[PDB]
Symmetry: C4
Subunit: 96 residues, 4 copies
C-alpha cells in the first residue's frame, strides 16, 4: 500500500523541473488507510498557486490505490523546501 | 553499553501504527538525554497536530522507564522542526518501498 | 539549461568564506524558463546586508544564460542556513 | 584560520551528551576576521539556560585565535536542533 502509493507518485511530474514529485523531495508524509489516503507535500516555490495542478495530479494518482475512495492532499510550506531535498538521481538529471 | 545506547534500543520497540515502523527509524526522536533518575526525550509526530490521546508518546515514556536508574521520564512532543519522510533511516525506506 | 545555470553559479564566490554560493549551500531554488531565470537563495548570517553583493553577482551570472533578460533573485532566511548545508567538497576546503 | 577555529571548538564538550559541540552539530556558522570572531550556535534543549556554559566556553576558545580580541557568540534556536545533526562519529559513540 505504501510502496504502491510511492510508485504511483513517481508518475507525477513537476513541469518546471521536469522531474517527479518524489525525486524532487516534495512529498513530506504519506499515509494510506482505506478508504482514505493522506499526503502532505510542498511546492518548490513558497506560495499558493492559482491552480494547484501538482497537488491535483497527486490526488488523482493516490486515488488509483486499492481501497482508496477518499484522498486528502495537504500542501504546506513547513518546512520550507530547498534543492537540498533532491534525491541523488534528481541531481544527476539536472546536472547539479 | 551506555544508558544512551540502551535507550535507543528500547525506543526501537515503540511502533507507529500508521506506518508500521519504530519511532527511531522513522526519525521521530529529536533529543534524548538520560540522567538518572531522569530521562528526557523530545520527539515529534508524523502529522502536525496533537492527537486526542498521544499513544505514541506514552509508549515512549514506557520504554524509557525500563532504563536502569530511571524513575521519571519527561516526554516533550514538539513540531519544531516540522517532520518529513526525509528523516526516515535508510532501513526504514527499504521496508516501506520508498 | 538548469545544468548551465548551476555551473554559472559556481563562479559566484562569497568573500567571507572564500567558496562559491553553490558549494556553500546558499542556493535553495533554481528555475530557468527564458526569458526568465529564478533563484531563491539565502546568506550565511541572518539579516539583510546594506548591499547584497552576493545577490547581485547571482543576478549577473544568470543574466548570461541563453534568452534571459529578467532574472529574479529572492533572498530568504527560510529555512535558516547552517554549515551543515556545505557540500563535501566545501567542508574539504575549509578543513571542517 | 578557519581551522584554528574549527579545532578550538571541537574541544568544547557538552556534559549532557558527553561530546564536543562540533560533533554534536551545535555550531551553525563560524567566522573569524581579527580582531573579530563570530560564531552562531544552538543548544540541544529549547530554551535559554540560566548559565549558558557552552556559549561562555565557546567564547573562551575563540578568544585565543590569532589576534582576536572581540568574540561574538550568537546562541539561536533557528533552525531548531535535533539528533539528526550529529556527525557519524557522535553516532558510533552514543550507540545511536
Amino acid at each position: 500500500l505504501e510502496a504502491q502509493a510511492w510508485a504511483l507518485l513517481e508518475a507525477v511530474y513537476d513541469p518546471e523541473l521536469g522531474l517527479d514529485v518524489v525525486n524532487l523531495g516534495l512529498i513530506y508524509d504519506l499515509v494510506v488507510e482505506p478508504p482514505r489516503a493522506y499526503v502532505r507535500m510542498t511546492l518548490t516555490t513558497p506560495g499558493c498557486p492559482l491552480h494547484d495542478s501538482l497537488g491535483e495530479a497527486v490526488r488523482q494518482a493516490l486515488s488509483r490505490l486499492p481501497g482508496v475512495e477518499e484522498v486528502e492532499v495537504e500542501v504546506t510550506f513547513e518546512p520550507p523546501w530547498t534543492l537540498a531535498r533532491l534525491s541523488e538521481k534528481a541531481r544527476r538529471l539536472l546536472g547539479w
